[PDB]
Design an enzyme around this catalytic site. Structure first.
Site, mmCIF file in Angstrom:
data_model
loop_
_atom_site.group_PDB
_atom_site.id
_atom_site.type_symbol
_atom_site.label_atom_id
_atom_site.label_comp_id
_atom_site.label_asym_id
_atom_site.label_seq_id
_atom_site.Cartn_x
_atom_site.Cartn_y
_atom_site.Cartn_z
ATOM 1 N N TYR A 151 0.716 -1.075 0.179
ATOM 2 C CA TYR A 151 0.187 -0.043 -0.003
ATOM 3 C C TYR A 151 0.871 1.320 0.205
ATOM 4 O O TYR A 151 0.242 2.328 0.013
ATOM 5 C CB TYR A 151 -1.196 -0.046 1.374
ATOM 6 C CG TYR A 151 -1.905 -1.405 0.854
ATOM 7 C CD1 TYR A 151 -3.024 -1.177 -0.244
ATOM 8 C CD2 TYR A 151 -1.518 -2.541 1.365
ATOM 9 C CE1 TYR A 151 -3.707 -2.390 -0.343
ATOM 10 C CE2 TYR A 151 -2.311 -3.609 1.298
ATOM 11 C CZ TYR A 151 -3.469 -3.695 0.172
ATOM 12 O OH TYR A 151 -4.140 -4.806 -0.126
ATOM 13 N N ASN A 176 -3.593 6.249 -5.625
ATOM 14 C CA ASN A 176 -3.784 7.224 -4.917
ATOM 15 C C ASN A 176 -2.471 7.929 -4.553
ATOM 16 O O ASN A 176 -2.402 9.178 -4.375
ATOM 17 C CB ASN A 176 -4.783 7.083 -3.686
ATOM 18 C CG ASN A 176 -5.022 8.478 -2.905
ATOM 19 O OD1 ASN A 176 -5.718 9.278 -3.353
ATOM 20 N ND2 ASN A 176 -4.272 8.551 -1.648
ATOM 21 N N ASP A 236 -5.724 17.299 -6.981
ATOM 22 C CA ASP A 236 -6.051 15.916 -6.574
ATOM 23 C C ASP A 236 -7.461 15.895 -6.489
ATOM 24 O O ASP A 236 -7.970 16.681 -5.507
ATOM 25 C CB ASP A 236 -5.278 15.550 -5.452
ATOM 26 C CG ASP A 236 -5.799 14.172 -4.492
ATOM 27 O OD1 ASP A 236 -6.528 13.641 -5.445
ATOM 28 O OD2 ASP A 236 -5.388 14.337 -3.248
ATOM 29 N N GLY A 293 -1.172 13.725 3.023
ATOM 30 C CA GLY A 293 -1.418 14.051 1.598
ATOM 31 C C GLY A 293 -0.349 14.430 0.853
ATOM 32 O O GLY A 293 -0.382 15.048 -0.197
ATOM 33 N N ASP A 323 0.274 11.877 -2.075
ATOM 34 C CA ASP A 323 -0.894 11.888 -2.907
ATOM 35 C C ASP A 323 -0.272 12.368 -4.327
ATOM 36 O O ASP A 323 0.185 13.458 -4.588
ATOM 37 C CB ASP A 323 -1.995 12.777 -2.520
ATOM 38 C CG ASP A 323 -2.955 11.809 -1.586
ATOM 39 O OD1 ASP A 323 -2.413 11.595 -0.646
ATOM 40 O OD2 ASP A 323 -4.130 11.966 -1.942
ATOM 41 N N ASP A 363 -7.993 0.207 -4.769
ATOM 42 C CA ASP A 363 -7.717 0.607 -3.363
ATOM 43 C C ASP A 363 -8.130 2.303 -3.224
ATOM 44 O O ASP A 363 -7.674 3.012 -3.921
ATOM 45 C CB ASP A 363 -6.313 0.457 -3.178
ATOM 46 C CG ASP A 363 -5.842 0.864 -1.440
ATOM 47 O OD1 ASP A 363 -6.448 0.155 -0.489
ATOM 48 O OD2 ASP A 363 -5.119 1.598 -1.246
ATOM 49 N N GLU A 400 -12.856 -0.386 -3.218
ATOM 50 C CA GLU A 400 -13.102 -0.052 -2.092
ATOM 51 C C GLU A 400 -13.159 1.451 -1.506
ATOM 52 O O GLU A 400 -12.423 1.943 -1.596
ATOM 53 C CB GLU A 400 -11.696 -0.650 -1.070
ATOM 54 C CG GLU A 400 -12.337 -0.774 0.326
ATOM 55 C CD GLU A 400 -11.386 -0.903 1.399
ATOM 56 O OE1 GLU A 400 -10.655 0.076 1.832
ATOM 57 O OE2 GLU A 400 -11.191 -2.013 2.122
ATOM 58 N N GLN A 427 -3.991 -6.143 11.526
ATOM 59 C CA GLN A 427 -4.813 -4.928 11.631
ATOM 60 C C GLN A 427 -6.023 -4.836 12.421
ATOM 61 O O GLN A 427 -6.234 -3.825 13.406
ATOM 62 C CB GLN A 427 -4.827 -4.086 10.441
ATOM 63 C CG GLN A 427 -3.544 -3.645 9.843
ATOM 64 C CD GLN A 427 -3.705 -2.794 8.744
ATOM 65 O OE1 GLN A 427 -3.470 -1.645 8.928
ATOM 66 N NE2 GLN A 427 -4.107 -3.312 7.339
HETATM 67 CA CA LIG Z 1 -5.847 11.921 -3.480
#
Ligand SMILES: [Ca+2]
Ligand SMILES: [Ca+2]
Length: 415
Positions: free
Chosen positions: A75, A113, A148, A156, A159, A190, A216, A302
């Protein structure tokens, strides 16, 4: 394996998929660099178990680390290079080939992302001031900025401006690459809250228009601004809206929220129990994932929104026999011993011809959840934690017991 688009052009691949989530959060710590080898060796089993598709881990290498700890799960990737913590590029191709060969489609988890921007040695270097990043623009807060069009991830500062022609193009080419050299039959998107739903449709249109996709979107009503219609909408309406725009099935977070906060009777309120087939059919149901659930190993993983063990069987019984497209968590299937039970249900679903758009009716006069599912081959009567006494109390026809587990708490009859 039937393969079309929904009546609304949603990419549900015939509405007959049964997905295995092919990993747990700690695989990189528990079977370091060996995961693709394990999958390659299990392919025949997975296929024999009844799965039509498998959700593979993020293939993009991730060597991140943070401290209890984590990192390398995918991720926070830094490159499109496949020689990561799950195994080598070569092992990946072998794994994909073995699964594809056993008849299981390969769905790759993709993370558009953000990326591990600060990772020193990476093959992808996008400079600042040029508009490739979110933070190239003024970042007021966790809201879309000019760089974005979605929410940001944490700070961020990692990002990406996925709308930047060169960034869009970059993902698009990797998606095509996964399909042409890594046997991708589809993608799991994701953190869809981080970028426009429309972009998912473009990427899909460009690279695998006829594939299976799932997004998701985990964002409750209270997370939208006060003036947004979403701030007062149901979980069902928020995810449905995304699916309508991305033209992809969406994870049924409406059903997950009811499983976590409501009673079993309330399960009828997930997207998948919706009386409109255009609504139900785009739902991708699950019990737990790598995020919400536990994982073997290290700190139990998690477990951000885990379903208590006393409801695991009931939950699987429900998603495997109802509308929408079900997902089985690796762990429940292969680590924790629910495997045999899941196998029977898969067989029950297939025998009845239950599909994403099958009809489901909930019966109000008994305790727990009582539902009638109109599969294309058979009708199923499902009674979970119910006082129902015989299937004939709620449905016409001749029924045989298909499943009877956890001291009558899980019961399924077929016509
Ligand atoms: Ca974003
Ligand atoms: Ca299909």
């Amino acid at each position: 394996d039937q393969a079309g688009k929904s009546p609304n052009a949603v990419r549900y691949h015939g509405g007959d998929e049964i997905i295995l989530q092919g990993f747990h959060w700690n695989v990189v710590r528990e079977a370091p660099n060996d995961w693709y080898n394990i999958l390659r060796q299990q392919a025949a089993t997975i296929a024999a178990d009844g799965f039509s598709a498998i959700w593979m881990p993020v293939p993009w290498r991730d060597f991140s680390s943070w401290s209890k700890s984590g990192g390398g799960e995918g991720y926070f990737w830094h490159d499109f290079n496949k020689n990561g913590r799950y195994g080598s590029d070569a092992q990946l191709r072998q794994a994909a080939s073995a699964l594809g060969g056993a008849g299981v489609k390969v769905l790759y988890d993709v993370v558009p992302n953000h990326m591990n921007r600060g990772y020193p040695d990476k093959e992808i270097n996008l400079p600042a001031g040029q508009g490739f990043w979110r933070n190239d623009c003024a970042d007021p807060g966790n809201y879309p900025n000019d760089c974005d069009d979605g929410d940001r991830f944490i700070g961020g500062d990692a990002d990406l401006n996925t709308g930047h022609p060169q960034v869009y193009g970059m993902f698009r080419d990797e998606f095509t690459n996964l399909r042409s050299q890594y046997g991708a039959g589809g993608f799991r998107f994701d953190f869809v809250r981080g970028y426009a739903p429309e972009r998912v449709n473009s990427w899909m249109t460009d690279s695998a228009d006829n594939s299976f996709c799932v997004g998701e979107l985990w964002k409750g009503p209270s997370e939208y601004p006060n003036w947004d219609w979403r701030n007062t909408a149901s979980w069902q309406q928020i995810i449905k809206d995304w699916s309508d725009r991305a033209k992809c099935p969406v994870f049924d977070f409406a059903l997950k929220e009811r499983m976590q906060n409501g009673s079993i009777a309330d399960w009828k309120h997930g997207l998948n129990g919706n009386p409109d087939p255009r609504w139900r059919e785009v739902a991708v149901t699950f019990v737990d994932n790598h995020d919400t659930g536990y994982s073997p190993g290290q700190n139990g993983g998690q477990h951000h929104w885990a379903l208590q063990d006393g409801l695991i069987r009931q939950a699987y019984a429900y998603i495997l026999t109802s509308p929408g497209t079900p997902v089985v968590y690796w762990d429940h299937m292969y680590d924790w011993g629910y495997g045999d039970f899941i196998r029977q249900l898969i067989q029950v679903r297939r025998a009845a011809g239950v599909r994403a758009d099958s009809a489901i009716s909930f019966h109000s006069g008994y305790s727990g959840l009582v539902a009638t599912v109109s599969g294309s081959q058979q009708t199923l009567v499902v009674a979970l934690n119910s006082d129902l006494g015989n299937p004939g109390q709620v449905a016409s026809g001749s029924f045989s017991e298909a499943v009877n587990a956890s001291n009558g708490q899980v019961r399924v009859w077929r016509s």
